[PDB]
Amino acid sequence: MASRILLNNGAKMPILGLGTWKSPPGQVTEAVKVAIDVGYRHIDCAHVYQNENEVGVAIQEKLREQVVKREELFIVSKLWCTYHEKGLVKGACQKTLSDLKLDYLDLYLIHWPTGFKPGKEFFPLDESGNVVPSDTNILDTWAAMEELVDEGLVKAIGISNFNHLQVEMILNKPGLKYKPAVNQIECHPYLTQEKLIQYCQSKGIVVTAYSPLGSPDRPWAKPEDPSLLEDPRIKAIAAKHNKTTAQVLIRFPMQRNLVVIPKSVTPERIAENFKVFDFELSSQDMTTLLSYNRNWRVCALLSCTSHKDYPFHEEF
């Protein structure tokens, strides 16, 4: 299958990218180096992951080694929640650009719909544990994102963790300048996202699937949470194809016309995870994997459930 998907800005986005959340700076430079060597051309970043400097060190090295040119790369980052005020957006983007040593991003996302109180702390809480919101709204933050395209800092803008009504809010904004190009959402066999994918695709919004392996390294995991990589049913599908469970989990979203961004810092796994363009999951495989949906979320904070823009009260 084709390695890139067409966005609404006329640019092509690689359908397989490298995730970088929880890649420590002490290891992410080597990860990105290896990824580029083995063919990754999309890297998913964020300011909150606090490793964009080291990601940037890799891109620059590989540019200087003559391994890749900038136009071939597709670099994504995201505006953190403490920067939703219209006056903070450009500076947040420019900090990401400076850390990554880039002059533009291919795609810049509103990381979460929830604005948090501005300040140094990424998750400001009150005395008992709820996040402290900011008096920001989706539409004004979107307008600020649009300005970044009009100044040449970013080629495309999109959203992440937006429910369909939040997406609709942007689509229906009077005076909209740019439609979101992408909605990046959690998606895997335990959270198959049928209704939100159908919605987004029916708008020409491309969907990126995050945590496709179930984020086993997420820092809030409980031993009794369900584990995709160890699910014997998925292992059986992998065995039949002489592939790993991770390779099945990466191929799955690709066959749904999604982009997918598995994370690893392990060189062997980085290479493994890219070797998914040479087999196909059957109709039965696809149906079986979709049947495993449990509406189970890696990423959803309790602490954000009272925010006016918390995305996950809506069904989709």
Ligand X SMILES: NC(=O)c1ccc[n+]([C@@H]2O[C@H](COP(=O)([O-])OP(=O)(O)OC[C@H]3O[C@@H](n4cnc5c(N)ncnc54)[C@H](OP(=O)(O)O)[C@@H]3O)[C@@H](O)[C@H]2O)c1
Ligand Y SMILES: O=C(O)COc1cc(Cl)ccc1C(=O)NCc1cccc([N+](=O)[O-])c1
Q: Which of 29, 77, 114, 166 binds ligand Y (CB under 6 A)?
A: 114
14 binds ligand X, rule: CB under 6 A: no
Q: Which does 15 bind (CB under 5 to 8 A by kind): ligand Y, ligand X, none?
A: none
Asked whether position 75 contacts ligand X by CB under 6 A, the answer is: no
Q: For residue 193, give both structure tokens.
A: 């996202």
45 in contact with ligand Y (CB under 6 A): no
Binding segment for ligand X among 14-22, 126-134, 193-201, 282-290 (CB under 6 A)? 14-22
Q: Does 192 bind ligand X (CB under 6 A)?
A: no
Sole residue written with tokens 């996040």: 131
Among 6, 48, 107, 267, binds ligand Y (CB under 6 A): 48
- By the rule CB under 6 A, 29 interacts with ligand X: no
**Toward ligand X, which CB reaches closer, 106 or 272?**
272
Q: Say if residue 248 carries a ligand binding annotation.
A: yes
Among the candidate windows 193-201, 247-255, 264-272, 294-302, which touches ligand Y by CB under 6 A?
294-302
CB-wise, 36 or 48, nearer to ligand Y? 48
Minimal CB distance residue for ligand X: 19
Q: How many CB atoms lie within 10 A of CB 157?
A: 27
Q: Is 22 in the site for ligand X (CB under 6 A)?
A: yes
Catalytic residue (one of 40, 49, 178, 310): 49
Q: Establish if 217 lies at the interface with ligand X (CB under 6 A).
A: yes
User: How many C-beta neighbours within 10 Å does residue 314 have?
Assistant: 11
310 binds ligand Y (CB under 6 A): yes
Question: Rounded to whole angstroms, how far apart are CA atoms 209 and 197?
Answer: 10
Cα–Cα dist 175/163, whole Å: 21
- Least distance from C-beta 185 to ligand X, angstroms? 8
Q: Contact between 299 and ligand Y (CB under 6 A)?
A: yes
State the minimum distance, in angstroms, from the CB of residue 309 to ligand Y.
Answer: 8
Among 20, 114, 141, 163, binds ligand X (CB under 6 A): 20
Are 180 and 169 a contacting pair, CB within 8 Å?
Answer: no
Which pair of structure tokens corresponds to residue 279?
């087999």
Binder of ligand Y out of 21, 74, 108, 142 (CB under 6 A):
21
Is 38 a binder of ligand Y (CB under 6 A)?
A: no
* Residue 131 near residue 114 (C-beta atoms within 8 A): yes
Contacts with ligand X: how many residues (CB under 6 A)? 32
Measured distance CA(35)–CA(274) in Å, rounded: 9
Is 21 near ligand X (CB under 6 A)? yes
Size of interface with ligand Y, in residues (CB under 6 A)? 12
For residue 269, give every residue at least 6 positions away whose Cβ sits within 8 Å of its Cβ, in sequence order, or none: 246
Phi, psi angles (nearest 5°) of residue 275: -90, 65
Question: Has 104 been annotated as catalytic?
Answer: no
Q: Which residues of the chain form contacts with ligand X (CB under 6 A)? A: 19-22, 44, 111, 160-161, 184, 210-218, 229, 244, 246, 261-266, 269, 272-273, 298-299
Binding site, annotated residues: 10-19, 111, 211-273
- Catalytic residue positions? 49
Which residues are annotated binding-site positions for NADP(+)? 10-19, 211-273
